[PDB]
Amino acid sequence: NLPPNAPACMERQLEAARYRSDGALLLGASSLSGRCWAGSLWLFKDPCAAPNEGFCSAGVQTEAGVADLTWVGERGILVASDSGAVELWELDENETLIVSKFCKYEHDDIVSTVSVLSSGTQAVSGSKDICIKVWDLAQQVVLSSYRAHAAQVTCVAASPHKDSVFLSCSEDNRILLWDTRCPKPASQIGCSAPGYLPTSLAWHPQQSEVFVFGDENGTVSLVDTKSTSCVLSSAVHSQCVTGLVFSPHSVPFLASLSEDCSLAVLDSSLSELFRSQAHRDFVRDATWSPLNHSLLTTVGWDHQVVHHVVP
Amino acid sequence: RVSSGRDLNCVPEIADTLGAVAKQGFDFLCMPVFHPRFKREFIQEPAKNRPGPQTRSDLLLSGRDWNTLIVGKLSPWIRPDSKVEKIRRNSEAAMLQELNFGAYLGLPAFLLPLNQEDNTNLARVLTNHIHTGHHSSMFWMRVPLVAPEDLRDDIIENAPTTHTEEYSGEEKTWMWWHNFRTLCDYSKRIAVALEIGADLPSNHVIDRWLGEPIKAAILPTSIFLTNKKGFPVLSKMHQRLIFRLLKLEVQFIITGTNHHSEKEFCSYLQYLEYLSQNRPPPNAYELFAKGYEDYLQSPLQPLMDNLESQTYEVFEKDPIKYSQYQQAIYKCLLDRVPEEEKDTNVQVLMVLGAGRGPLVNASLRAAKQADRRIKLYAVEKNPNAVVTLENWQFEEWGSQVTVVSSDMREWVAPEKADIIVSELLGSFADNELSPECLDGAQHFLKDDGVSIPGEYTSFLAPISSSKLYNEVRACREKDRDPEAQFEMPYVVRLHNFHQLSAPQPCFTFSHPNRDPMIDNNRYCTLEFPVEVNTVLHGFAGYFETVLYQDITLSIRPETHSPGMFSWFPILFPIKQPITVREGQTICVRFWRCSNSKKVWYEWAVTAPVCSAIHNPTGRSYTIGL
Ligand SMILES: Nc1nc2cc(C[C@@H]3CC[C@@]4(O)[C@@H]3C[C@@H](n3cc(F)c5c(N)ncnc53)[C@@H]4O)cc(F)c2cc1F
């Protein structure tokens, strides 16, 4: 038996997978092919039940496809839609239904990336319209609209504990370090050589000045904001690095997602420890379990929810 | 009315989205044929063997809906000029797959972006797609007036925006288009989809797109301002570009989400329809020129060929032309015979090339206005035109007009003429052989005799038109030289073009020719200063003529006769386009050559670079004697 309001069929192409502090798994699916080209939001209190529709906790269908997803506290869900709107969907008191809070069409093109800031009251969004908007989740409006890049914004990542600091990368070969406290917030950083276009961004959960980025060639690089010159880099994948996620350990492990249908686990020196080719399609999002820190759940366009045992 | 389209990068239900945009008033819809995020793999496994379908079915819309309402869109992830070999190879196969699917649906247009300098491999894949099967499908190249790198917010601390003036750097997007269309060998299937930014560039950057094949104008919702009532409007400078684009008859495309939440999506289109209705109405010339805009016509040869009845009817429906001819004879009669000789002296008028009798009737009205005695001689070589003159002579004119069915160069007049009237002029004045005809006719004109017209000068101006160059390039005919089309002039209402320099006088002729050794052969060197970066495609020809004293007729844009529409400008093209920089001078050499049987034009460019001598010995073009 499936919960009320939830659809009978889940969309084939899985884009997002995010674990909530209690252990509940949040899923973001999109219909990229076929007659209908919309998206859907799903919640699983039992992570092993996914991707089965009739074994979920809450379900709803959005008007357009889901490009990116992020947890807003414990009930709010921020959606990066193709319609050009940044949506917010709040979970009800019984946690059985997913109701819409706001749907504001501010971006002129597909919103490809979203990241909630340290406080949880503000959030940042990157779209194909080259713009980066700072949102106010309580007032449901845009505080600041920025056009610093020259091409489509690929990834936006809010710093772990700073409300003013956030990273942004685009197809214009620019990695910008932001600080809303500055008159000119953006700042161009990276390696000595321009190299290949940046695709993914990940802040270190312990070091507030260190971060990692993946390029379109499959290379993952360790960057320090102070040195502004790349110290360590390794060719992890054969194709574009989709995303990078850190484990909740005191000494964090780095999970690398790519279009080459493989997932890799790296240490502090970016050395390969674990590799899985279980996915038949593009690995889109990875999430570490808050209960079992050695467990990592990944989703792909092949409608698969694979739970990995990281040694 | 404005032919409009809606640009959307998100279509959940094709039947519901098309029905919604049609309700708003959009004539067409710019939408993706494949999902913009659905990245496809063609080489590496297991991503290569992805289960289908790859996109939505063609059965969702009728054949008519795909052929007229849907405009295709290339996926943003397709980058054929990427530095990564894997992305470069995958984008080539994805570009072919998307273009072939657009040809399968039979779409009237397909959008492809020009967002960077290097688009060589993108040009290679598109040119290969055009040469794979014969199709009429269009390809709109999405290129902005200002590059996104040149309009970005100055918010990067270590990388600030260039505040210094860069004349050539500001016109970088035109070079992206120019390089792309040159690589694609000027394909008529490739057009410009010009995107207009929030802040307009300098007037010279907007002037780079003059003479370019613009079929679409993209207007984002962000560029629209908001008035006191809440309706979306545009700035006075933005409106100027809309009126300029409306003249070229482009299709306006609206992109981006609605920022005016209080109003509907139709409010943006309502303002475009308002500007189309509040624009200056087409004048007597602008209404007549409709349909003939950039339409190439062969220059008339009335001496060699006998013209049709409908060709004379078009010549006759010009009131301004014959009103000036009437005033020219009216002024000449009073200057030749005074008030004391208004009944004892009769002036011998000779209409050389009478046609159907418009100058013959104008000579009769001029005599009634000046109150003077006249004796008309209506000379015409065309026997078909003589049938109309002889029927006019018997029914109305009477014994006053003497119809002569002979050539003016071979006719033996019984008496000498006081005034000789003619309309032998063409678009380039002497191109229809007016000097040669009057030189062999001035023997039967009295020693103090007057000629109407008595003087005429041709004018040349360098022009830039990639549209007209491609129109001449398509005029290739079998059983003749494959480059003969470039070595001949064309009478054309020049519309989508750019005048690079002010028209300068070329060849001048005066009648009667008092010279002891009359030579109609000419050689002229013209130096045109160019203050813009451009590409020379040809030379526009105009003419000025002095009928009598202050009474004149002109097709020169600076001194054009108001209401007159008999002659459209002439066009002398060049085999190869010449790149001209700012401050450079265009030097053209024009020759008027002739023998006993034919007269022709020869032309060559000598600066900034040298061109081949066009039409040597009259191999491609000749005006028979
Ligand atoms: N481009 C344009 N050209 C125009 C030309 C004309 C002159 C017409 C053309 C037909 C015609 O009857 C007449 C002139 C005649 N004609 C031509 C000769 F060389 C000739 C000659 N040698 N003897 C006797 N008559 C002759 C010729 O047969 C009339 C216009 F209204 C024109 C308007 C235009 F826009």
Q: Is B41 annotated as a binding residue?
A: no
What's the gap in Å between B265 CA and the centre of ligand 1? 57
Tokens of A142: 């845009």
Q: How far apart are CA B523 and CA B545, in angstroms?
A: 20
Alpha carbon distance B124, B105 (integer Å): 23
CB pairs A-B closer than 8 Å: 132
DSSP labels, B190-251: EEEEEEPPSS---HHHHHTTTTS-EEEEEEEGGG-EE-SSS-EE--HHHHHHHHHHHHTT-E
Which is nearest to B445 in space by CA: B415, B425, B423, B403? B415
For residue B212, list its beta bridge partners.
none
Extract the tokens encoding B445.
């004109």
Q: Smallest Cβ distance to B156: which of A37, A148, A281? A: A148
Ligand 1 site, CB within 6 A: B 300, 302-303, 307, 315, 353, 355, 379-382, 385, 407-409, 423-424, 426-427, 432-433, 437, 566-567
Q: Which residues of B touch A151 (CB under 8 A)?
A: 115, 148
Asked whether the beta carbons of A215 and A196 are under 8 A apart, the reply is yes
Shortest CA distance to B536 belongs to which of B502, B577, B584?
A: B577
CATH topology of domain B4-297: TIM Barrel (3.20.20)
Count of other CB atoms within 10 angstroms of residue A51:
17
Q: Give the integer Cα–Cα distance in Å for A109 and B257.
A: 8
The Cα–Cα gap between A69 and A77 comes to: 7
Measure B14 CA to nearest chain A CA, in Å.
Answer: 8
Cα(A73) to ligand 1 centroid in Å equals 88
- Cβ-based neighbours of A73, under 8 Å, separated by 6 or more: A120
Whether B434 and B420 have beta carbons less than 8 Å apart is answered as no
**Å from B6 to nearest chain A CA?**
13
Are the C-beta atoms of residues B532 and B500 closer than 8 Å to each other? yes
User: Is residue B205 within 8 Å of B170, Cβ to Cβ?
Assistant: yes
Strand order in the sheet with B401-405: B401-405, B373-380, B346-352, B417-421, B445-452
* Residue B380 CB partners (closer than 8 Å, separation 6+): B353, B354, B355, B386, B389, B403, B404, B405
Q: Which residues of A touch B154 (CB under 8 A)?
A: 184
**Full 3-state SS string of B278-309:** CCCCCCHHHHHCCCCECCCECCCCCCCCCCCH
Sheet hosting strand A198-203, strand order edge to edge: A198-203, A210-215, A219-224, A232-235
Q: Which two tokens mark B600?
A: 């022709």
- Cα-Cα-Cα-Cα torsion B221, B225, B227, B229, nearest 10 degrees, comes to 10
> How far from B306 is each of A146, A301, B271, B300, B319, CA to CA, in Å?
70, 74, 52, 10, 24
Using alpha carbons, select from B572, B564, B560 the residue that is nearest to residue B491.
B572
Residues in chain A after which the chain is broken, C→N over 2.5 Å: none
Kindly state the tokens that stand for A31: 């219909």
Which atom of ligand 1 is the closest one to the Cα of B355?
Answer: 12
Q: Taking a C-beta distance cutoff of 8 angstroms, is the pair A28, A69 a contact?
A: yes
* Spatial separation of the C-alpha atoms in residues B332 and B446, rounded to whole Å: 14
Peptide bond preceding B383 in cis form (omega within 30 of 0): no
Alpha-carbon span B115 to A240, nearest angstrom: 21
Residue B429, exposed/middle/buried by CB under 10 A (0-12, 13-18, 19+)? buried
Residue of A201, A205, A146 lying closest to A169 (CA atoms): A201
Experimental method reported for this structure? X-ray
Q: How far is the CA of B491 from the centre of ligand 1 (A)?
A: 16
Nearest to A196 among B46, B84, B158 (CB): B84
The set of residues, in sequence order, having a beta carbon less than 8 Å from that of B244 and lying 6+ positions away, is: none
B263 is in an annotated binding site: no
Bin B152: left if φ > 0, else alpha if -120 < ψ < 50, else beta.
beta
